[PDB]
Structures are given as structure tokens and as C-alpha cells.
Amino acid sequence: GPMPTPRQKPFQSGSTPLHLTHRFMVWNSIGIIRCYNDEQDNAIDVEFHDTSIHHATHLSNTLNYTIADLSHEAILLACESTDELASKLHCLHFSSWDSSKEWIIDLPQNEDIEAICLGQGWAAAATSALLLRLFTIGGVQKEVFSLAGPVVSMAGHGEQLFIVYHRGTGFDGDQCLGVQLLELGKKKKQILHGDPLPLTRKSYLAWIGFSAEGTPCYVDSEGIVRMLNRGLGNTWTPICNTREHCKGKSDHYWVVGIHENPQQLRCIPCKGSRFPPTLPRPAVAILSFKLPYCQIATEKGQMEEQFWRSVIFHNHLDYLAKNGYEYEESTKNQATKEQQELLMKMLALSCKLEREFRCVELADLMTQNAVNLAIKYASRSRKLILAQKLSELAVEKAAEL
Amino acid sequence: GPMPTPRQKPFQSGSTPLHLTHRFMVWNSIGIIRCYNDEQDNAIDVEFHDTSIHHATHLSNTLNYTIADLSHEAILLACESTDELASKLHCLHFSSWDSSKEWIIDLPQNEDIEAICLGQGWAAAATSALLLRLFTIGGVQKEVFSLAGPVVSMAGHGEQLFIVYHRGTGFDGDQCLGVQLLELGKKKKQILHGDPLPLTRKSYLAWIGFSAEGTPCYVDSEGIVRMLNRGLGNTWTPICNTREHCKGKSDHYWVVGIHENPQQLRCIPCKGSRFPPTLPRPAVAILSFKLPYCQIATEKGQMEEQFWRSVIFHNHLDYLAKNGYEYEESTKNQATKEQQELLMKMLALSCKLEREFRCVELADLMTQNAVNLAIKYASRSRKLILAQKLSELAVEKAAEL
């Protein structure tokens, strides 16, 4: 019969393993942090993508840091439990307006920190004792709550938290994972209450986080990048297959950051290792989205993939409009126009294939000006029944528009 | 130590496995499909309960399209992966008005199909990539999204679609299944989120599907039939046990359909087998429901569940009316009268039994006009001490509404 597996360890996104003497602490869009320690000294280095917020700086390792995260306004540094010394967290609010420039938190004995994250004016940290705690960047503490299982990792953006934990045990190479989404809004909420996390068969989760536009995403060992489509009842859709971008087994990609719209998948191809070498530091490459649809080699398949890309390229922007955060309107304009153009090309090729059912099925999603243009496409080559039924669709939708 | 069980293999509802050369492949509410295979040749046969939909048809292909489904709009087919090719998915739009009668698509490298299903215009297939693919019958690719484990079966009706997959594995004869349910409307939703599937102890999932009105239903290997009560917070309610019917003359009852007006479960009786053989043509058996309400016998227990079976089915009709779908107003009108007269008879029974609190608490479940009728019944039976506080509760209901 099946054999139970050992449990894979927790991780912090951007933190390379501690067994290497010289290591990266965290990669962020705001900046990058590095660390070194050996038989006689220990040190931290921090640099920013834009030094107007703060100058690049060298920091010393007093609390034996192992975990980190960065924001536009503050930096968190934290560590795991230890018998002779407490687990601790240290926040450096470098952009502080007053004497709140830094503060420290030292946990109860045998309580740890395994993951932390930052957001808009708040900070968060969680322990392997199945609970999470919240803080504010000026130093006031916030609510505490407990987690459904052994916590693996967590991240956040704006005023929203993504948590990943172990919900059970896997068998014959499988791993058992679940996921939480929490909201720190005006009325705090939990839109996803502990569902099983989709993951490729016999894979291991490799990286979690958010795109710069504030929607959650992740990737596992088999390289299927996934993102939370809210238009599908908050369901995980694949968005890239980076093993196809790899040259072979020698390669694996380490994500530095993601931008949904404009499109940039920023990552480093690591050679012969699960993480980049700390020196000579590699350069970050930009990859592009590619969906696991069928008949990818066909041009119709390509425009189908582009349509289902473009709809989600504006769904998350509308979600930002609802929750109140800012976005650049050109992103919405380009996505919302290109989806109409792409599905109109789909409808035109369907009409040239004289599949009236396919034409109506595509026209069901369209705006009425495009339905009129589809009726004119049907009038070309004298497809009277297709034109009549598209007109019926137009009338039926106008009865409610 | 404790023994983990193997995961049960995938299955397509309304089918017989490959133990028989000319096995059943589909039996749905409007048609039947058969699958043929031998040492050198293979074929498929198509039938409808009325030839006005489409006449009997014979198909054959080099690939065994081992998976199929049937609907009033089209027939759906799919084949397994091979050493030479990956899987393909196929559609027969027999109900079309023109020459769009057929469609074919081939899936990416190394991919295989476990189960497929149909809906109102939509179609779907679970894949070995831990991805669900969704289409139209006209061949438009809808959303592709991720799943947490191997899918064991699939089903659909209207816009509501049913997925069941292994959450983990069971121990000592049991298995750990879980259920995820979507409704693919214009503002589509998730009804179940991979929650564990209730099943009888030491049993497996023998059949899934929908009742004719569109409620989700399934049956376990022990013969327990159960369905989703969406009105009661989306809870699974058992309705019947098939094995005991007809003094257990059949080894099993292979269900083919369910309907609420008249109350019917239509099945095939199976001798010495879990499933029926294809030949000679079987005789259909129709059974009444048997709710698991306690102290059932002597016609006083049975009237309680005769009340409750009504709402157990008819919570769905309120949904189907308020969402804009067509529904059976005859069933609505009849059930809302049956409930009140049955409650009045129960109130008379409890008054005859001098258990006046039962009369009061049935009156709480009445409607307002039926509360006034309860006052009249209590007056006719000269039980004024009951009628007093009954009138008090009537005034309270009138205050509420």
C-alpha cells in the first residue's frame, strides 16, 4: 500500500538557505538584502531600488537574524526559536517621522518566527506553534489568531494576507498543503477559509507572493506559476510554465518579483542549484506568461490564450478599484480593448468556418457595438440565419442593458 | 501500525467497467451509450430514449474513446493516452440544425483524461495535469484552472458543475474524498471548496449525478443515496438506502435517474454484481424514498419524514425561481399546501395525544393562515388552554410579518 512521506520545511520567500556562508536575505521590488557570516564575524547589507527613500547601508547582526522582508517605509528582520536566546523580530522604520525609527519584539520561550511580511502601515509574523500576530509600523501591536495547521509560509500586499500551511500528510511522494486568505480592511474578513492548495503532482512549493498589482500567486517545483482569478469564484488559474522556459534539468527559476499588467515575470535562472549563487551575483531575466491550454501551436489557440490573459489583466484592476487602491488606467484600457479585439478575431474565424453556434457562443461575452459588427460580419457572405440569431441575442441583451 | 488505504481509481457515472466486452458507457435522463472492444476491433453505439432527439447511431475509431457523457444538446467523448499519442476529446452535436454535427481536439504531450461531463452549453474534462478544462459544445475553450489532487469522477447540470477528488487517503478500509462545486453563471460562484465528502464507513463512491430539477446527488457502495440541501446552508442530507428494497433480492441497484414529482428513483436491478450487464435489455425499477428518521414505523414516525422530504427537495425550487431559471410552479403550489395540511394533521395528532407542546411547536412552523386554522382546530377540539398561547404566538407572527 501507500507509504507516508516526510514533511517539507517552511520557508521565507526571497531568503536563500542559511547553510551558505554568504547569502541573500530577501529579494523585493523595493530592494535587496544580503548577509555574510563565518568563523570570526557576521554582517548584514541592505540596498534599495530607489535610494530616495533611504541610502544603501551596512548593518551588523546582533540578534542572529535569519528571516527578513522589506517595504517602502520599513524593514523587518527576525529569527527562529532557540533555548539559550529568545526568538526575536526587529523593525527598522527608516522613513519614520519621529522617534519611532525602530522597535524590537522578543517572543515567549520556545515560540519562534518562521515567516513575516510587510504592508501598508502594518507588519505580520507567524510561529510554528500554529499562530500569527500583527503589528503597526510605528510600534503598536495588533490582533493575534491561530492557524489551521503547521504553518509553512506567508506573505501580504496592501491590507491582505496570504498564508500557506500543512493540512495533513502526503503519500508516495505527495505533499499535503492548504491555504488561507485574510483581510485587514475596514471590516476585517476571510475570503478563503483554509482550502486545499492546488499543486503539481509530487511537487514541492518553491515560492509564494503577490504581483505588484496586489493579487496573489505562487509556483512549485514543476514550475506551474498560478494566480488567484477572482472572476472564477476566487480559484487558482495557471499563468506560466517555466520548466518550458528552462533549457533543461540544469536550470530552475528563482522569482524576484512579478508584474501582472504591464507583464513582467522577473526571475533568475539558477544553474545546478535550487537558488542563485551569492557571488558572482546573476542578472535577473524577464519571462512572459504562457497558459497550459490545448492546441498551443495553433494561432487560434494563441488568441484564445491571449483573451483569457486579457480578461484577468483587468479583473484584478477592477478589484483594486473596489478595495480603493490606486492603479494606472492605461493597463485597464489596453486589457479591456484587446480582449474585445481578440474575441472578435475568434468570431471572425468561426464565421469563416461557418460555425454559427461557435459565433453565438463567442458573441455572448461581447459588448453590443461588437455584436453589431459581428452581425455585419455575418451579413458579409450572406449568413442570414447567423445574422438573425445574433440580432436576437442583441435584442435579448438590450432588454436588460 | 495503522494501514493507509489505496486511492480508489477514477470512474464515469452511468457506466459498466471493461470486464464486459460490450459494456454500458452512458445512461442519462435522455439517452444511452454503449462501448465495444475485442482483440482486434472496437466501436461505440448511441441511443436516445426518444428518436425525435436523434436516431440510433454507430461510431468507431482507432482510439478507444473510453469516457463519454450524454445530454439533450450533444454527446461528449474522450480517449486515454497511449505510447504513440496523448488523449483527445470529441463532441457529437447531433441536436444541431445544420452541418456543425461534430468537433475534435487533441490535448498536450503526456496528458490523459480521467472523467468528463456536460452542462447547458458547457462541457468539461478533468486531466492528469491536476487541471480542469472547460469548453462549450461548439468548441470554445473556457477557463482552465488547478486542482489539489487526482479527480475520481465528474458531473454537471444546467450551470452547476460537480468535481470530486482525493483530499488524502483513508485508513483501514476507508478513503478520504472531497468535493468542489461551481456554478458557471454570468457572475459565477463556488458552492463547495474541496470539503470532505460524507460517506458510509468503509465504503466507496459508486455513483454521482443530479436529480432532474438540478440538485447535486450521489450514491455510495453501501447503497445510501444523498443530496445537497442548499437551503440548509449547503448540507448533505441522505434520502434513501437502495440495498434493502425488494427484500434485497438484487445485489445492487444501479441508479439512472431521480425526480421529485412524482417522487421516483429509477435504477437497474443487478444480480450478483455491482453493475448490470448490457444484454438482454434490462427492466427499469422505480422506488420511493426512505428518509433515515428514527422511530419510523407505525405511521406516526413516517408522517414526520413525509413532511420533511418535501422541503429537502423543494429548497432548490426557491433558488431556481429567484435566480431566473424555469421551475415547476405546480410543485411549488402543491408543496406549500401539503405542508400546511400535514402540519395541521400532526397538530391534531399531538392534541389527541395531549402533548400540547408539540402542537405549539408545530404551530411555530406553520404559516400565518395555518396558525389561525390551528386556533380553529383547537377550538373545535375544545383545547382552550392550548388555543390561548397559540393565539399569542399568532399575534407574534402577525407582528413579525
UniProtKB/Swiss-Prot annotation, chains A, B:
Domain of life: Eukaryota
Cellular localization per UniProt: Nucleus, Nucleoplasm
Transmembrane annotation, as ranges: none
N6-acetyllysine modifications at: K249
Job description of the protein: Core replisome component that acts as a replication initiation factor. Binds directly to the CMG complex and functions as a hub to recruit additional proteins to the replication fork.
SUBUNIT field: Trimer. Interacts with the polymerase alpha catalytic subunit POLA1. Interacts with MCM10. Interacts with DNA2. Interacts with CDC45 and GINS2 subunit of GINS complex; these interactions associate WDHD1 with the CMG helicase complex.
Name assigned to this protein: WD repeat and HMG-box DNA-binding protein 1
Originating species: Homo sapiens (Human)
